[PDB]
Amino acid sequence: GTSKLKYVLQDARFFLIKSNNHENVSLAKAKGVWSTLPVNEKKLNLAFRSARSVILIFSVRESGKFQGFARLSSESHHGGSPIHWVLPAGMSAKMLGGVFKIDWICRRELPFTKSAHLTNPWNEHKPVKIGRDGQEIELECGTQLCLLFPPDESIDLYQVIHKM
Ligand SMILES: CNc1nc(Cl)nc2c1ncn2-c1ccccc1
């Protein structure tokens, strides 16, 4: 069902995460971590303190899809074992140095064709697929987008509700 999912998304904040490659999203799914550039790291840290749930919705550049969504379980922290991210050109490792812990809510894909009816007020009412890495998605649009994903029956949200 969708009741626990709706509970987790209640009064949540939502952020679009753009990845330049699939390898980093795969690593995030396996290890439950994400790192972003310092401008977005600061925004996510502020949001984590401000809201019951902060949701990252992932899209690999040029894939035409979202690859799933996850909830922050921590602010960013430094000094773990360096995550072996695949850096795009110009991207350095100190740039991606802060590591957030995340709990996946859905690891299934959603094609952009299925979200064409959803527009984001915080990005000029452009289709929600459109946005830079870190773009915030308004509550109603973000909730409806998350509800469009296929259900992920491998995930039990009971432990996530307890983190809240
Ligand atoms: C592990 N974190 C990341 N991994 C990768 Cl491959 N790309 C990222 C990441 N964070 C932001 N970007 C990004 C988004 C749009 C254009 C250029 C770079």
PDB file of C-alpha atoms and ligand atoms in Angstrom:
ATOM      1  CA  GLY A   1       0.000   0.000   0.000  1.00  0.00           C
ATOM      2  CA  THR A   2       0.854   3.700   0.082  1.00  0.00           C
ATOM      3  CA  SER A   3      -0.194   4.836   3.570  1.00  0.00           C
ATOM      4  CA  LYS A   4       3.228   4.643   5.236  1.00  0.00           C
ATOM      5  CA  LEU A   5       4.747   6.356   2.167  1.00  0.00           C
ATOM      6  CA  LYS A   6       2.239   9.204   2.473  1.00  0.00           C
ATOM      7  CA  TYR A   7       3.103   9.503   6.173  1.00  0.00           C
ATOM      8  CA  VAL A   8       6.825   9.801   5.416  1.00  0.00           C
ATOM      9  CA  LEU A   9       6.102  12.475   2.762  1.00  0.00           C
ATOM     10  CA  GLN A  10       3.830  14.501   5.066  1.00  0.00           C
ATOM     11  CA  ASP A  11       5.207  18.051   5.310  1.00  0.00           C
ATOM     12  CA  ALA A  12       8.429  16.884   3.655  1.00  0.00           C
ATOM     13  CA  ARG A  13      10.816  18.971   1.609  1.00  0.00           C
ATOM     14  CA  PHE A  14      11.967  17.736  -1.797  1.00  0.00           C
ATOM     15  CA  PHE A  15      15.146  18.366  -3.811  1.00  0.00           C
ATOM     16  CA  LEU A  16      16.014  17.319  -7.358  1.00  0.00           C
ATOM     17  CA  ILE A  17      19.435  15.642  -7.511  1.00  0.00           C
ATOM     18  CA  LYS A  18      21.143  15.459 -10.897  1.00  0.00           C
ATOM     19  CA  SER A  19      23.986  12.984 -11.342  1.00  0.00           C
ATOM     20  CA  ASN A  20      26.327  13.063 -14.304  1.00  0.00           C
ATOM     21  CA  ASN A  21      26.632   9.258 -14.388  1.00  0.00           C
ATOM     22  CA  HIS A  22      24.830   6.090 -13.361  1.00  0.00           C
ATOM     23  CA  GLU A  23      27.807   4.801 -11.374  1.00  0.00           C
ATOM     24  CA  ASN A  24      27.367   7.333  -8.580  1.00  0.00           C
ATOM     25  CA  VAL A  25      23.643   6.625  -8.242  1.00  0.00           C
ATOM     26  CA  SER A  26      24.426   2.905  -8.085  1.00  0.00           C
ATOM     27  CA  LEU A  27      26.983   3.551  -5.349  1.00  0.00           C
ATOM     28  CA  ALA A  28      24.436   5.671  -3.459  1.00  0.00           C
ATOM     29  CA  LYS A  29      21.888   2.837  -3.660  1.00  0.00           C
ATOM     30  CA  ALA A  30      24.405   0.268  -2.383  1.00  0.00           C
ATOM     31  CA  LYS A  31      25.945   2.325   0.424  1.00  0.00           C
ATOM     32  CA  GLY A  32      23.132   4.675   1.472  1.00  0.00           C
ATOM     33  CA  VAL A  33      25.178   7.862   0.994  1.00  0.00           C
ATOM     34  CA  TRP A  34      25.165  10.962  -1.159  1.00  0.00           C
ATOM     35  CA  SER A  35      27.568  13.846  -1.705  1.00  0.00           C
ATOM     36  CA  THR A  36      26.915  17.085  -3.598  1.00  0.00           C
ATOM     37  CA  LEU A  37      28.636  20.385  -4.360  1.00  0.00           C
ATOM     38  CA  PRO A  38      29.097  22.905  -1.510  1.00  0.00           C
ATOM     39  CA  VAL A  39      26.246  25.203  -2.573  1.00  0.00           C
ATOM     40  CA  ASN A  40      23.767  22.317  -2.439  1.00  0.00           C
ATOM     41  CA  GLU A  41      25.397  20.804   0.653  1.00  0.00           C
ATOM     42  CA  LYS A  42      24.637  23.987   2.601  1.00  0.00           C
ATOM     43  CA  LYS A  43      21.014  24.021   1.394  1.00  0.00           C
ATOM     44  CA  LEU A  44      20.463  20.361   2.327  1.00  0.00           C
ATOM     45  CA  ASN A  45      21.993  20.822   5.783  1.00  0.00           C
ATOM     46  CA  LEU A  46      19.628  23.741   6.481  1.00  0.00           C
ATOM     47  CA  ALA A  47      16.676  21.761   5.163  1.00  0.00           C
ATOM     48  CA  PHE A  48      17.511  18.705   7.279  1.00  0.00           C
ATOM     49  CA  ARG A  49      17.069  20.739  10.473  1.00  0.00           C
ATOM     50  CA  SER A  50      13.898  22.422   9.173  1.00  0.00           C
ATOM     51  CA  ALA A  51      11.657  19.535   8.140  1.00  0.00           C
ATOM     52  CA  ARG A  52      10.387  16.161   9.322  1.00  0.00           C
ATOM     53  CA  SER A  53      11.685  14.560   6.095  1.00  0.00           C
ATOM     54  CA  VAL A  54      14.030  15.810   3.376  1.00  0.00           C
ATOM     55  CA  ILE A  55      13.600  13.818   0.156  1.00  0.00           C
ATOM     56  CA  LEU A  56      16.183  13.602  -2.638  1.00  0.00           C
ATOM     57  CA  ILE A  57      14.763  12.632  -6.034  1.00  0.00           C
ATOM     58  CA  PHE A  58      17.530  11.357  -8.327  1.00  0.00           C
ATOM     59  CA  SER A  59      17.941  11.748 -12.089  1.00  0.00           C
ATOM     60  CA  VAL A  60      20.975  10.703 -14.125  1.00  0.00           C
ATOM     61  CA  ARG A  61      21.745  13.260 -16.825  1.00  0.00           C
ATOM     62  CA  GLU A  62      20.569  12.235 -20.321  1.00  0.00           C
ATOM     63  CA  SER A  63      18.770   9.145 -19.011  1.00  0.00           C
ATOM     64  CA  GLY A  64      15.295  10.620 -19.481  1.00  0.00           C
ATOM     65  CA  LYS A  65      14.284   9.115 -16.138  1.00  0.00           C
ATOM     66  CA  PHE A  66      14.394   9.460 -12.390  1.00  0.00           C
ATOM     67  CA  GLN A  67      16.189   6.546 -10.698  1.00  0.00           C
ATOM     68  CA  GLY A  68      14.417   6.685  -7.331  1.00  0.00           C
ATOM     69  CA  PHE A  69      14.177   8.749  -4.165  1.00  0.00           C
ATOM     70  CA  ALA A  70      15.598   8.657  -0.653  1.00  0.00           C
ATOM     71  CA  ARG A  71      15.307  10.472   2.681  1.00  0.00           C
ATOM     72  CA  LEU A  72      18.193  12.234   4.403  1.00  0.00           C
ATOM     73  CA  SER A  73      19.025  10.553   7.684  1.00  0.00           C
ATOM     74  CA  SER A  74      21.880  12.918   8.633  1.00  0.00           C
ATOM     75  CA  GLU A  75      23.543  16.213   7.891  1.00  0.00           C
ATOM     76  CA  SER A  76      26.755  16.028   5.882  1.00  0.00           C
ATOM     77  CA  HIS A  77      29.852  14.696   7.647  1.00  0.00           C
ATOM     78  CA  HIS A  78      33.517  14.406   6.732  1.00  0.00           C
ATOM     79  CA  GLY A  79      36.183  11.847   7.537  1.00  0.00           C
ATOM     80  CA  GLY A  80      34.628   8.523   6.587  1.00  0.00           C
ATOM     81  CA  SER A  81      36.309   6.202   4.133  1.00  0.00           C
ATOM     82  CA  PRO A  82      36.505   8.214   0.845  1.00  0.00           C
ATOM     83  CA  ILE A  83      33.571   7.190  -1.332  1.00  0.00           C
ATOM     84  CA  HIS A  84      34.832   6.110  -4.759  1.00  0.00           C
ATOM     85  CA  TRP A  85      32.631   8.479  -6.750  1.00  0.00           C
ATOM     86  CA  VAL A  86      33.230   8.741 -10.498  1.00  0.00           C
ATOM     87  CA  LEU A  87      34.123  12.378 -11.042  1.00  0.00           C
ATOM     88  CA  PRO A  88      33.011  14.141 -14.237  1.00  0.00           C
ATOM     89  CA  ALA A  89      35.395  16.531 -15.955  1.00  0.00           C
ATOM     90  CA  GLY A  90      36.253  19.531 -13.791  1.00  0.00           C
ATOM     91  CA  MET A  91      34.738  17.777 -10.755  1.00  0.00           C
ATOM     92  CA  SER A  92      37.160  17.240  -7.875  1.00  0.00           C
ATOM     93  CA  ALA A  93      36.922  14.960  -4.847  1.00  0.00           C
ATOM     94  CA  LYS A  94      37.177  17.717  -2.220  1.00  0.00           C
ATOM     95  CA  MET A  95      34.199  19.312  -3.990  1.00  0.00           C
ATOM     96  CA  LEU A  96      32.155  16.196  -3.143  1.00  0.00           C
ATOM     97  CA  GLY A  97      33.664  15.869   0.321  1.00  0.00           C
ATOM     98  CA  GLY A  98      30.639  16.118   2.602  1.00  0.00           C
ATOM     99  CA  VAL A  99      28.729  12.837   2.897  1.00  0.00           C
ATOM    100  CA  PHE A 100      25.035  12.591   3.777  1.00  0.00           C
ATOM    101  CA  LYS A 101      23.498   9.357   5.013  1.00  0.00           C
ATOM    102  CA  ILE A 102      20.266   8.472   3.181  1.00  0.00           C
ATOM    103  CA  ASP A 103      17.582   5.789   3.434  1.00  0.00           C
ATOM    104  CA  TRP A 104      16.125   4.756   0.111  1.00  0.00           C
ATOM    105  CA  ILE A 105      12.357   4.907  -0.174  1.00  0.00           C
ATOM    106  CA  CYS A 106      12.181   3.737  -3.806  1.00  0.00           C
ATOM    107  CA  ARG A 107      14.967   2.314  -5.968  1.00  0.00           C
ATOM    108  CA  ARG A 108      12.739   1.939  -9.060  1.00  0.00           C
ATOM    109  CA  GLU A 109      12.897   4.145 -12.162  1.00  0.00           C
ATOM    110  CA  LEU A 110      10.257   6.601 -13.388  1.00  0.00           C
ATOM    111  CA  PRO A 111      10.446   7.895 -16.992  1.00  0.00           C
ATOM    112  CA  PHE A 112      10.042  11.636 -17.516  1.00  0.00           C
ATOM    113  CA  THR A 113       7.129  10.871 -19.855  1.00  0.00           C
ATOM    114  CA  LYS A 114       5.089   9.887 -16.761  1.00  0.00           C
ATOM    115  CA  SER A 115       5.663  13.185 -14.910  1.00  0.00           C
ATOM    116  CA  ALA A 116       4.815  15.509 -17.822  1.00  0.00           C
ATOM    117  CA  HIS A 117       1.663  16.677 -16.001  1.00  0.00           C
ATOM    118  CA  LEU A 118       3.591  17.948 -12.932  1.00  0.00           C
ATOM    119  CA  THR A 119       5.058  21.463 -12.809  1.00  0.00           C
ATOM    120  CA  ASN A 120       7.267  22.935 -10.092  1.00  0.00           C
ATOM    121  CA  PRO A 121       6.222  26.388  -8.779  1.00  0.00           C
ATOM    122  CA  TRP A 122       9.769  26.963  -7.505  1.00  0.00           C
ATOM    123  CA  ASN A 123      11.149  26.648 -11.056  1.00  0.00           C
ATOM    124  CA  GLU A 124       8.725  28.890 -12.968  1.00  0.00           C
ATOM    125  CA  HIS A 125       6.149  26.053 -13.321  1.00  0.00           C
ATOM    126  CA  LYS A 126       8.424  24.205 -15.708  1.00  0.00           C
ATOM    127  CA  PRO A 127       7.912  20.428 -15.850  1.00  0.00           C
ATOM    128  CA  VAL A 128       9.378  18.912 -12.705  1.00  0.00           C
ATOM    129  CA  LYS A 129      11.978  16.984 -14.736  1.00  0.00           C
ATOM    130  CA  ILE A 130      13.536  20.374 -15.542  1.00  0.00           C
ATOM    131  CA  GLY A 131      15.890  21.732 -12.934  1.00  0.00           C
ATOM    132  CA  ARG A 132      19.500  22.099 -11.893  1.00  0.00           C
ATOM    133  CA  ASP A 133      21.092  19.822  -9.330  1.00  0.00           C
ATOM    134  CA  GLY A 134      19.721  20.932  -5.964  1.00  0.00           C
ATOM    135  CA  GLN A 135      16.519  22.577  -7.226  1.00  0.00           C
ATOM    136  CA  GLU A 136      13.834  22.501  -4.540  1.00  0.00           C
ATOM    137  CA  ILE A 137      10.465  21.010  -5.531  1.00  0.00           C
ATOM    138  CA  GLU A 138       7.375  22.499  -3.868  1.00  0.00           C
ATOM    139  CA  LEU A 139       5.500  20.185  -1.453  1.00  0.00           C
ATOM    140  CA  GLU A 140       2.477  19.294  -3.604  1.00  0.00           C
ATOM    141  CA  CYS A 141       4.453  18.696  -6.813  1.00  0.00           C
ATOM    142  CA  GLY A 142       7.094  16.691  -4.941  1.00  0.00           C
ATOM    143  CA  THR A 143       4.489  14.559  -3.180  1.00  0.00           C
ATOM    144  CA  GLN A 144       2.681  13.765  -6.418  1.00  0.00           C
ATOM    145  CA  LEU A 145       5.980  12.967  -8.163  1.00  0.00           C
ATOM    146  CA  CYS A 146       7.011  10.505  -5.457  1.00  0.00           C
ATOM    147  CA  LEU A 147       3.572   8.869  -5.598  1.00  0.00           C
ATOM    148  CA  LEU A 148       4.035   8.256  -9.350  1.00  0.00           C
ATOM    149  CA  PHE A 149       6.990   5.909  -8.857  1.00  0.00           C
ATOM    150  CA  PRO A 150       6.283   2.168  -9.046  1.00  0.00           C
ATOM    151  CA  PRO A 151       6.012   0.719  -5.543  1.00  0.00           C
ATOM    152  CA  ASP A 152       9.279  -0.715  -4.173  1.00  0.00           C
ATOM    153  CA  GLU A 153       8.191  -3.827  -2.306  1.00  0.00           C
ATOM    154  CA  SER A 154      11.765  -4.522  -1.171  1.00  0.00           C
ATOM    155  CA  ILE A 155      11.585  -1.549   1.241  1.00  0.00           C
ATOM    156  CA  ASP A 156       9.925  -1.468   4.680  1.00  0.00           C
ATOM    157  CA  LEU A 157       9.224   2.126   5.764  1.00  0.00           C
ATOM    158  CA  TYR A 158       8.699   1.130   9.408  1.00  0.00           C
ATOM    159  CA  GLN A 159      12.324   1.881  10.319  1.00  0.00           C
ATOM    160  CA  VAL A 160      12.205   5.164   8.382  1.00  0.00           C
ATOM    161  CA  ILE A 161       9.132   6.346  10.295  1.00  0.00           C
ATOM    162  CA  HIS A 162      11.080   5.648  13.504  1.00  0.00           C
ATOM    163  CA  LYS A 163      13.996   7.852  12.377  1.00  0.00           C
ATOM    164  CA  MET A 164      11.587  10.808  12.182  1.00  0.00           C
TER     165      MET A 164
HETATM  166  C1  LIG B   1      28.170  12.035  -5.962  1.00  0.00           C
HETATM  167  N1  LIG B   1      27.581  13.293  -6.383  1.00  0.00           N
HETATM  168  C2  LIG B   1      27.559  13.642  -7.780  1.00  0.00           C
HETATM  169  N2  LIG B   1      28.054  12.727  -8.749  1.00  0.00           N
HETATM  170  C3  LIG B   1      28.040  13.078 -10.143  1.00  0.00           C
HETATM  171 CL1  LIG B   1      28.652  11.950 -11.374  1.00  0.00          CL
HETATM  172  N3  LIG B   1      27.518  14.361 -10.582  1.00  0.00           N
HETATM  173  C4  LIG B   1      26.997  15.322  -9.560  1.00  0.00           C
HETATM  174  C5  LIG B   1      27.006  15.007  -8.242  1.00  0.00           C
HETATM  175  N4  LIG B   1      26.482  16.047  -7.577  1.00  0.00           N
HETATM  176  C6  LIG B   1      26.158  16.996  -8.483  1.00  0.00           C
HETATM  177  N5  LIG B   1      26.478  16.538  -9.709  1.00  0.00           N
HETATM  178  C7  LIG B   1      26.316  17.205 -10.984  1.00  0.00           C
HETATM  179  C8  LIG B   1      24.931  17.545 -11.527  1.00  0.00           C
HETATM  180  C9  LIG B   1      24.785  18.239 -12.880  1.00  0.00           C
HETATM  181  C10 LIG B   1      26.032  18.597 -13.689  1.00  0.00           C
HETATM  182  C11 LIG B   1      27.419  18.254 -13.147  1.00  0.00           C
HETATM  183  C12 LIG B   1      27.561  17.559 -11.796  1.00  0.00           C
END
